[PDB]
Amino acid sequence: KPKPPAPTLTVVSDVATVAMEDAQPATAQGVAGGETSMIAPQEVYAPSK
Amino acid sequence: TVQAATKLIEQGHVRVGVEEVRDPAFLVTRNMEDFVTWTVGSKIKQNIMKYRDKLDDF
Amino acid sequence: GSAIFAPYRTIGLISPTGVPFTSIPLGKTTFQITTSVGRALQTYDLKRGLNLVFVTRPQTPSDITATHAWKERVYAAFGDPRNGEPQGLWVFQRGKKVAELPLPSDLDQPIKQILIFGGWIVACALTRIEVWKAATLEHYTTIFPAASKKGDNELTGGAINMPTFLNKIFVGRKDGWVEIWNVSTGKLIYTLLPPSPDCGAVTCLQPTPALSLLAIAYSGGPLVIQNVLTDKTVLLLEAGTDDAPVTSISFRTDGLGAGQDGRKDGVMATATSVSGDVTFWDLNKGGRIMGVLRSAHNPPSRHNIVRGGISKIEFLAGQPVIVTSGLDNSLKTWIFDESPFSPVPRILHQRSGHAAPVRCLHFLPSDFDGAEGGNKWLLSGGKDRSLWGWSLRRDGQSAELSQGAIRKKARKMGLLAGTTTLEDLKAPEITCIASSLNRDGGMGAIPGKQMIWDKNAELSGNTGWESVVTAHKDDPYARTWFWGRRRAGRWAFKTGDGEPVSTVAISSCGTFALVGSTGGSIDMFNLQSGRHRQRFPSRFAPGTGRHTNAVTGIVVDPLNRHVVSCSLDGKVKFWDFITGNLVDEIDWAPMTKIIGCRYHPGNDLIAFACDDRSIRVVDIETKNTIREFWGCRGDINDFCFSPDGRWIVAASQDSIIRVWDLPTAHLIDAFRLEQPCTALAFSHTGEYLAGAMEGSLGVQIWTNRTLFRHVPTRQISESMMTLSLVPRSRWQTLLHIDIIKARNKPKEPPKAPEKAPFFLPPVGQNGISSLIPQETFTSKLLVGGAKGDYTDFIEHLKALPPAAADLELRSLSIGNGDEATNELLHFIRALTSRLVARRDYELTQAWMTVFLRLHFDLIMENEELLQALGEWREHQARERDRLSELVGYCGGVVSFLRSPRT
Amino acid sequence: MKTNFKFSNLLGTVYCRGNLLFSPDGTHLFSPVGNRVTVFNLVENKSYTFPFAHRKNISRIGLTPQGNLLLSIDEDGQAILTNVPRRVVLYHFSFKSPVTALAFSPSGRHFVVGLKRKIEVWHVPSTPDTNEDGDLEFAPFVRHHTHMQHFDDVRHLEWSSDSRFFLSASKDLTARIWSLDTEEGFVPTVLSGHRQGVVGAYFSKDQETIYTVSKDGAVFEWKYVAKPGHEDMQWRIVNKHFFMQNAATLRCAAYHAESNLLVAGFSNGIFGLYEMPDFNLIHTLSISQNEIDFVTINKSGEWLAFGASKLGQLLVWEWQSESYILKQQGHFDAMNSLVYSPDGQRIVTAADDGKIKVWDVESGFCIVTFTEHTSGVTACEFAKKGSVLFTASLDGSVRAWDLIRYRNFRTFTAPERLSFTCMAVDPSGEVIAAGSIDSFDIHIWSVQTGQLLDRLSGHEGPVSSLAFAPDGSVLVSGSWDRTARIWSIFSRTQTSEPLQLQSDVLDVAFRPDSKQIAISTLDGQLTFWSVSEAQQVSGVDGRRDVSGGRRITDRRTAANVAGTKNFNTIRYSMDGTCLLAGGNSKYICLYSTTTMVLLKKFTVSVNLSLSGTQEFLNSKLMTEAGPVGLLDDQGEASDLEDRIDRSLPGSKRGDPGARKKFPEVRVSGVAFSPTGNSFCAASTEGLLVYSLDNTVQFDPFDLNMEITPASTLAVLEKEKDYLKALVMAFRLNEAGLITRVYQAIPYTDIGLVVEQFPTVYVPRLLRFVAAQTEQSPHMEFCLLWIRALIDKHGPWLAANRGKVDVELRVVARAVAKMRDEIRRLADENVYMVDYLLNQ
Amino acid sequence: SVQAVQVFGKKKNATAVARCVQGKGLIKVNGKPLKLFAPEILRAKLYEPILILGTDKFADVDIRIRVAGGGHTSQVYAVRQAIAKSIVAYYAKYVDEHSKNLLKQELIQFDRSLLVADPRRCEPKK
RNA sequence: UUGGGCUCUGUGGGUGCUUGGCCGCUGGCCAGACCUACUUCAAAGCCACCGGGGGUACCUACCGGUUG
Structure with missing residues (x-):
């Protein structure tokens, strides 16, 4: 039996996918890829009380 | 006894779930001590089955 | 010749011809054997089995007629000039020819045999003996023996030196005489006459391990052993039958092995090229025989297609080993035994090829994608009625x-x-x-x-x-x-x-x-x-x-x-x-x-x-x-395929092999061989061809010059919106080229010292990269805009690496304030030019994208290029509308076709 | 379909323990994995490998400075050279001694090689590519010279610029200076005096001063100077330095005499680079925790290359900007699963190491890892829309990544703590299932809620295999209950159904034509069942058809080797014609799913470092000490971090201890390229990618006698019968010919061509025009071609949808590639310039 | 040594033993003839795999059969599964593997339960 | 088919792609031979695997001192 399931966070940044990526000269991604910031509009702002 | 057991495992007759066994120190957890059994078709299996008269060559 | 297949090797062969081997001891642990294919010579190991150490290259153009191998070099005489063939002698070392021997121009004789000693090599042709100084490889003299008779002047048998005689050669005539000549002065010093002169010719001769005793084998039959300075006969032996003459002889120097006790020396092996048997004598008391080895190979016969004989014997250096090479492509090395007595040796090593030509020829399919593979094993069905699995890789690991x-x-x-x-x-x-x-x-x-x-x-x-x-x-x-x-x-x-x-x-x-x-x-x-x-x-x-x-x-x-x-x-x-x-x-x-x-x-x-x-x-x-x-033009001997359905090779009766290109349905090749090729065989992947000729046993191996170099051979004989060629990686990284360097910047930085060495010596082509294609992009664009063709600067930016390209695209400037000095306006007009050219939509739009991305303040500040943006915008809107409606139609109905039941 | 599969390119690794090299240009990267070598092109993202092989692991490679010729060197002697642009074998050759050093000359005429003691220089034979009238020699390698003035292994070699002299690094604390011939002002001399062995000597550019770096981190610049008492000059030491790398000893050092820089690579995973003749530290950096195996440099000098043996760890590193070029992590475990996206330009693998990594099929390179999974990672799976992957591991927790923004946006544990061993997902991406060895009930979760939908059950034991039906309705589980369980789930009233087996279950797979389902059972049999009428359409054996054995440490013949007769996994072809299967065994089978025969069998390795890969082994290497590879050569080293044996006794699966020498072959899985025409097996050595070689083999469709390329060109130019020319071009199926005629037809007759084109020949034409869309610079040509095709055969393709499905999908990938590549930028730029003219 | 294979056959609580050894074609259940053993209307159902195989497959053998346990339908079913599994195993051990695959493909192609003890199980709708 | 069988032992090959036996090797030898010279300058540190809890009289080591 593996472990106790522990609560754990991982703080993301707002960088692109190809910024999060490992080290290559040129990504497999094209040009429509390479701009999304790892966080949705819900993330970048939530209207709330 | 552990002579028959160890020699048996050296010539490889004991599957463990799906894999075979070569290396007679495969530690066996309490969960696995049920799924130990004999391999795909060996003559040890057929010793068992030739004795209890369910020997069916198929 | 041909245009596809180059000749590579003839295999199925260890010793089929009549030329005997030559054998040298290496150190105290190995013995080199050297044998002639007929167009090459191989050298085998003895201790390391009977695998092949050296293969002689390049091929002699003619059939070899003599050889001997010294401490390092292989001396091979080829060519019977009596029928057309040019002759020569070559010096190889480790399978490769290092030198060539200067023949006398007046040699219209095939060259029979070779002997080397001292600083001299001697070579016997038919009745003529030529000498070279070996220390210089230079012609020294030519020995000319004389007899009263056209027959008797013939130099049959051969010649040898005694081990303890300085510069003296011992030759056999067609008469029963043996002539001693001093080679230093080139003078016939002595001759010895056959006792009981009914015996005709010296068929062979060999020094014994004792001093100054020659054994002579007579075609009339007697084997004699004689003192060679006393002219004192030691023994006669009636061993050669009249029409069954002995071929050659050897003595056992291993020191023991006679007298039936194991406790005695002096044994003779002899053999006759009429048989396949050999013979063993204990020489001590009466020169008794003790043992017949019956049929050590197949004996030669003219009633049958079988080919064979015994081309030589040899006792090697001081051991139970004896080699016999026959003519039945045949070597079997024999061994004396110690713990009992035995009459005969038993076999201890063997290599065999057929005694007849090869009938059928076939390859083995691959161990389905492994190593036993396409080109390893070739099966040969020989007219000696047998089946052999020949190894292309290492000829020893072939077998019967x-x-x-x-x-x-x-x-x-x-x-x-x-x-x-x-x-x-x-x-x-x-x-x-x-x-x-x-x-x-x-x-x-x-x-x-x-x-x-x-x-x-x-x-x-x-x-x-x-x-x-x-x-x-x-x-x-x-x-x-x-x-x-x-x-x-x-x-x-x-x-x-x-x-x-x-x-x-x-x-x-x-x-x-x-x-x-x-x-x-x-x-x-x-x-x-x-x-x-x-x-x-x-x-x-x-x-x-x-x-x-x-x-x-x-x-x-x-x-x-x-x-x-x-x-x-x-x-x-x-x-x-x-x-x-x-x-x-x-x-x-x-x-x-x-x-x-x-x-x-x-x-x-x-x-x-x-x-x-x-x-x-x-x-x-x-x-x-x-x-x-x-x-x-004759009946089809044999034909085979290509691995690919591209070629058919075919051999016919007239020794003409024609090759057809299947897709073009044409003739490629046609070439004539010295012999008709019976069977055809092609490796189970396309590298090799093996062809089976008639007569010549041991099939031929060709390579695929097409598989290596391209041949243009097609001689049928009788006797609108487009893309570019630029790396998609390159233009995409030109658009994305900041974030790649973010992801390639290390997480933890390199730790330079506080004492930073300023002015590192630069690398590459003078500080910048090799990737810039070598010979001022602003001058290029400005002279293209002074002209109308921007295409030189366009191809320059095309051939740019991405870092220099981004540098250049940030390096623009308006300049002095003229419409002929603003690289931006020239750039936009180059883009409109390429758009109306309908040539590089992708690279055009990409360079426009990054240009817009990093020059926006200047272009919303200037209108002289806003005119160009408007015109280019019209052109781009047309192209975008057309291509967008097109690709969207396509992809949409693609989705509708892939999932219609919704 | 037509099955003539050939060995296409390699992937699954980046590197192995062995010599790394650069093309003399500076774009092509030469890397050894095992025996087979791959090249990575660094400007266009390209990569491939060479069709040669070697029986052992690669120890050293050499290349001509001209470029075209490569000489690969495995250990234990044997070697092969090859022409690098025309990637074919040229020559094979046998050394009979273990190499230790290698250096091609800049002459392009010689190379110096070192067997452990003897040192040999050999000339380079000519090539048929480089001589016009010339061919292969028979025994082409020619010995030039050889010297044995030495006492130990010969570590390194370095030629001079002039190709007149070279320095050799020993192991007996010496370096040796030699001339190719007899010079006049030369002695065949020796550099003496050290503490821990000359690992590398080097000339300068000017052949005046030289360097020796030694394993204890000690550099020595030597000069040909007089003896200190004043014709009488000695090559003697003029100055020395140390690297104060405190608690390690370096292993590999290179030095650019052109720009005079020296790089040094160490046992503690941190290298240092230096401006050498003044000995000034450029900097240092830890590339890894483990150590450095081999270091090299660019010819221009701008790039540094490092291959670390133990973890994958190949990295090229731009020092002047202090950034990488590429930094690649390869498996130190067994690749438990592999899958292409439905896009099919990328494969995600998951090994038992913890790392999972998405690589692209193009370029052969890894774009990303996820590494939050704290145990060995078992299987993964994709959706229909492919933008999300699901991973299950041995940490006891499932995680789901969206594959456009790359985060674990779903995390399950099962509550009563399980340990996952097989997983799967709905094709629509709605519910995950996972099946275990802890609690044999099978588990279903829903991707939106994320909380536990339901335990299913009906299983005497753990569920060994999991597969879903691509419609979205039917599940299959397979288990050592001796059951195949078809799970009728997404109606209202759920049910089970047994297919009872005579045996036990190891894997299940599907037909996209979802009537057919197949089972691999451990007795070897494979079985296809009709899925509604839950009944056996066919069964066949596979024992002898994969019986490849004699793994080491076994006293059986490969006759009776159990557990090399189990098909680990199966997979139908993209059309659904050929079942592909592969297991714990030397071989992979490929069968027709209509009349049940072996269409094609293929080897998973040729290599012989690894263990049980050639079904008989021999009485030479069997000693009386047991089998000879087994006497512990982890006991003989100088590296203390080799001499340590941190193994526990006998655990057949994963740990840091890593007995990990002579691994067996287990062929850990296979996956078809969903674009078809290519597949790849994932195996302990790597990931072997076979394709469909349809280029170098002639294969017509249904030809006539009078159909010749000349006749096609005749009816092309003179007659201009475009439809007839096209159909005879297809009927011949010659690549350049069909390309030529396709370019030849103008863009107006396309409508009549497709209007009277035959439906017998349409689908291969769709594949070909998709290929043209992929590979040709003629977009609008191809796109109008497609528009005419869909205008004509919209109804017919909608009628079939299944004999044409893979071709439809490759049309989909063509149009989607063009779309997401170009039209996004088109709209973006027109909007950009519109607002900029609005100011 | 002597050509002999021995094969079971399974039902709820029928079970049958059959011994396939070389012969010229005799077939007996418990020692009595096959055309005598059944409720005679199911005799065709027992005859079935004979009629798919063709008798010349059965020409070279001789089978003893034991049955025991259970009622009539149970028994005849046990006899047929013993017949099938026995003739397949006899071909397995003593003639061409391709011929074993021939009989298995044909017979299974007809009817599934002639080779598998698919047990009556207890999984209603839960 | 003018005897044959089981069983054991012995030899060689091959069970992996065909480049020498040796040496003090740009050369020499295999029958070998020659045999004891010459000399400017010790070394840079670090690491270094013992089963756990427990005691330390004596020994070792480390640290910090002390007389000389």
Whole structure:
């Protein structure tokens, strides 16, 4: 039996996918890829009380 | 006894779930001590089955 | 010559000709053997088995007529000038020719034999002896013996030196004389006359391990041993029969091995090229014989096709070893035994090639994608009635594929003694073989010993059964083989008609061997069973489809649904495999007579050899001929495929091999050989070709010059919106080229010292990269805009690396304030030019994108280029509207077609 | 379909223990994995490998400075050279001694090689590519010279610029200076005096001063100077330095005499680079925790290359900007699963190491890892829309990543703590299932809620295999209950159904034509069942058809080797014609799913470092000490971090201890390229990618006698019969010919061509025009071609949808590639310039 | 040694033993003839795999059969499964593997339960 | 088919792609031979695997001192 399931966070940044990526000269991604910031509009702002 | 057991495992007759066994120190957890059994078709299996008269060559 | 295949090697050969070997001891642990192919020489190891150490390159243009190997070099004399052939002598070292020997121009004689000693080499031609100083490799003199008679002046037998005599040669005449000449002065010093002069010629001569005693072998029969300065005869021996002269002789220097005690020395081995036997004498008391070795090879005979003899004997340095090379492509090294006495030696090493030409030739398919592979093993069916598995990789690991304890069978009988002979005991010769390693599981195939061709299934069907079928000459029974076990299996198959077998092939899956007779019937046997299951036909109109003639050319589809079967005269019938029944046939009876076929899967393609010297190629599914070819001038000897369906090679009676390009349906090649090539064979992937000539046993190996270098050979003889060529990686990184350097910037930085060395010495082409194609992009763009063609600067930016490209695209400037000095405006007009050119939409829009991305303040500040943006915007809106409607139509109905039921 | 599969390119690794090299240009990267070598092109993202092989692991490679010729060197002697642009074998050759050093000359005429003691220079034979009238020699390698003035292994070699002299680094604390011939002002001399062995000597550009770096981190610049008492000059030491790398000893050092820089690579995973003749530290950096195996440099000098043996760890590193070029992590475990996206330009693998990594099929390179999974990672799976992957591991927790923004946006544990061993997902991406060895009930979760939908059950034991039906309705589980369980789930009233087996279950797979389902059972049999009428359409054995054995440490013949007769996994072809299977065994089978025969069998390795890969082994290497590879050569080293044996006794699966020498072959899985025409097996050595070689083999469709390339060109130019020319071009199926005629037809007759084009030949044409869309610079040509095709055969393709499905999908990938590549930028730029003219 | 295979046959609580050894074609259940053993209307159902195989497969063998336990339908079913599994195993151990695959493909192609003890199980709708 | 079988032992090959036996090797030898010279300068540190809890009289080591 593996472990106790522990609560754990991982703080993301707002960088692109190809910024999060490992080290290559040129990504497999094209040009429509390479701009999304790892966080949705819900993330970048939530209207709330 | 552990002579028959160890020699048996050296010539490889004991599957463990799906894999075979070569290396007679495969530690066996309490969960696995049920799924130990004999391999795909060996003559040890057929010793068992030739004795209890369910020997069916198929 | 040819344009595709270059000559590489002739194999199947260790020593077939008449030239004897030469043998040197290396150190105190190995012995080099050196033997002539006939167009080369190989050197074998003795201690390390009998593998091949050196192969002599380049090939002599003519048949070698003499050789000897010194401490390092191989001296080989080639060429009988009496019939056309140019002659010479070459000096090789480690298989490669280092030097050449200067012949006298007045040599119209083939050069018989070679001897080396001191600082001199001597070479005996026919009656003439030439000398070179070996320390300089220079011609010194030429010895000319004289006799009163045209016959008696002939230098038969040979010549030798004594070990303790300074510069003295001992030659045998055609008369019974031996002449001693001093080579330093080139003077005949002495001669010795044969006692009892009824003996005619010195057929051989050899110094003994004692001092100053020569043994002379006479064609009249006597073996004599004599003092050579006293002229004192030590012993006569009546050993040569009149028409059965001895060939040569050797003494045992190993120190013991005579007198029946093991406690005595002085043993002579002798042999005659009329026999296959050799002979052993204890020389001490009466020069007694003690032991006959009977049939150490096949003896030569003119009534039979068998070729053989004994070209030499040798005792090596001081050990129980004796080599005999015969003419039966044959070496067997023998060994004296110590713990008992024995008359004869037993064998201890062997290498063999055939005693007759090769009939059939075949390759082995790949260990399905492994290493045993395409080009390793080639099966050869020799007219010596045998089957050999030849190794292209290391010729030693070739072997016979025996038929049992056959030699012991002969020895229990009298085939080795004095009825038939051994080729007549082994199975008859080989019509046609087929192999399939789709079950050939190697040494473990059937554990134990198994009977042979008999005329139990758990263990068998677990691992592996036989895998090679062979059709033989006049048997009604065809034969199986355990390939991976190197022996005949247990299974022979008749025809049922009883007529002798015509041809045989096997399933795609190693399961059923199928044989077609010369009677017409087609039969099928399961190997694991060795059981008949299907005759064609069994019992269109069913039950009546039997071939009216001989049946050559039988193969199966690999799916084993339809089996195609050609009658020699008439038609080709296609049969439902499972039903054994004739489905579909095609007849060319009144005009052709089909004499064979080969079938390549991977293409569903079959070539047919038909007796009007033609080849008809059919695609099997569409059941109609697709590719007929008429190039031959004799009957078709043998033909084979390409791995790829691109080439067909064919050999005919006239020693002319023609090659056709199948896709172009054309002639490529045609080339003539010195001999007619009987059989054709092609490696199971396209690297090698092996061809079987007539007469010359040991097949030929060619390479694929096309597989290496491209040949343009096509000589049929008789005797709108487009993209670019730029890396998609390159333009995408030009758009994305900041974030790549973010992801390639290390997480933890490199830790430079606080004492930073300023002015590192630069790298590359003067500080910047090699990736910039070498010879001012602003000058290029400005002179293109002074002109109208921006295309030079356009191709420059095209050929740019991405870093320099981004540098340049940030490096623009308006400049002085003129419309002829603003690289931005020139850039936009180059883009509009490329857009109306309709050439590089992608790179155009990408450079526009990044330009807009990093020059926006200046372009919303300036309007002189806003005009150009508006015009280019019109052009781009047209192109975008057209292409967008197009690609969206396409992708949308693509989705609608991929998921319509919604 | 047509099955003539050939060995296409390699992937699954980046590197192995062995010599790394650069093309003399600076774009092509030469890397050894095992035996087979791959090249990575660094400007266009390209990569491939060479069709040669070697029986052992690669120890050293050499290349001509001209470029075209490569000489690969495995250990234990044997070697092969090859022409690098025309990637073919040229020559094979046998050394009979273990190499230790290698250096091609800049002459392009010689190379110096070192067997452990003897040192040999050999000339380079000519090539048929480089001589016009010339061919292969028979025994082409010619010995030039050889010297044995030495005492130990010969570590490194370095030629001079002039190709007149070279320095050799020993192991007996010496370096040796030699001339190719007899010079006049030369002695064949020796550099003496050290503490821990000359690992590398080097000339300068000016052949005046030289360097020796030694394993204890000690550099020595030597000069040909007089003896200190004043014709009488000695090559003697003029100055020395140390690297104060405190608690390690370096292993590999290179030095650019052109720009005079020296790089040094160490045992503690941190290298240092230096401006050498003044000995000034450029900097240092830890590339890894483990150590450095081999270091090299660019020819221009701008790039540094490092291959670390133990973890994958190949990295090229731009020092002047202090950034990488590429930094690649390769498996130190067994690749438990592999899958292409439905896009099929990328494969995600998951090994038992913890790392999972998405690589692209193009370029052969890894774009990303996820590494939050704290145990060995078992299987993964994709959706229909492919933008999300699901991973299950041995940490006891499932995680789901969206594959456009790359985060674990779903995390399950099962509550009563399980340990996952097989997983799967709905094709629509709605519910995950996972099946275990802890609690044999099978578990279903829903991707939106994320909380436990339901335990299913009906299983005497753990569920060994999991597969879903691509419609979205039917599940299959397979388990050592001796059951195959078809799970009728997404109606209202759920049910089970047994297929009882005579045996036990190891894997299940599907037909996209979802009527057919197949089972691999451990007795070897494979079975296809009709899925509604839950009944056996066929069964066949596979024991002898994969019986490849004699793994080491076994006293059986490869006759009776159990557990090399189990098909680990199966897969139908993209059309659904050929079942592909592969297991714990030397071989992989490929069968027709109509009349049940072996269409094609293929080897998973040729290599012989690894263990049980050639079904018989021999009486030479069997000693009386047991089998000879087994006497512990982890006991003989100088590296203390080799001499340590941190193994526990006998655990057949994963740990840091890593007995990990002679691993067996287990062929850990296979996956078809969903674009078809290519597949790849994932195996302990790597990931072997076979394709469909349809280029170098002639194969017509249904030809006539009078159909010749000349006749096609005749009816092309003179007759201009475009439809007939096209159909005979297809009927021949010659690549350049069909390309030529396709370019030849103008863009207006396309409508009549497709209007009277035959539906027998349409689908292969769709594949070909998709290929043209992929590979040709003629977009609008191809796109109008497609528009005409869909205008004509919209109804017919909608009628079939299944004999044409893979071709439809490759049309989909063509149009989607063009779309997401170009039209996004088109709209973006027109909007950009529109607002900029609005100011 | 002597050609002998021995094969069971399974039902709820029928079970049958059959011994396939070389012969010329005799077939007996418990020692009495096959045309005598059944409720005679199911005799065709027992005859079935004979009628798919063709008798010449059965030409070279001789089978003893034991049955025991259970009622009539149970018994006849046990006899047929013993017949099938026995003739397949006899071909397995003593003639071509391709012929074993032939009988198995044909017979299974007809009816599934002639080779598998698919047990009546207890999984209703839960 | 003018005897044959089981069983065991012995030899060689091959069970992997065909470049020498040796040495103090740009050379020499295999019958070998020559045999004891010459000399400017010790070394840079670090690491270094013992089963756990427990005691320390004596020994070792480390640290910090002390007389000389």
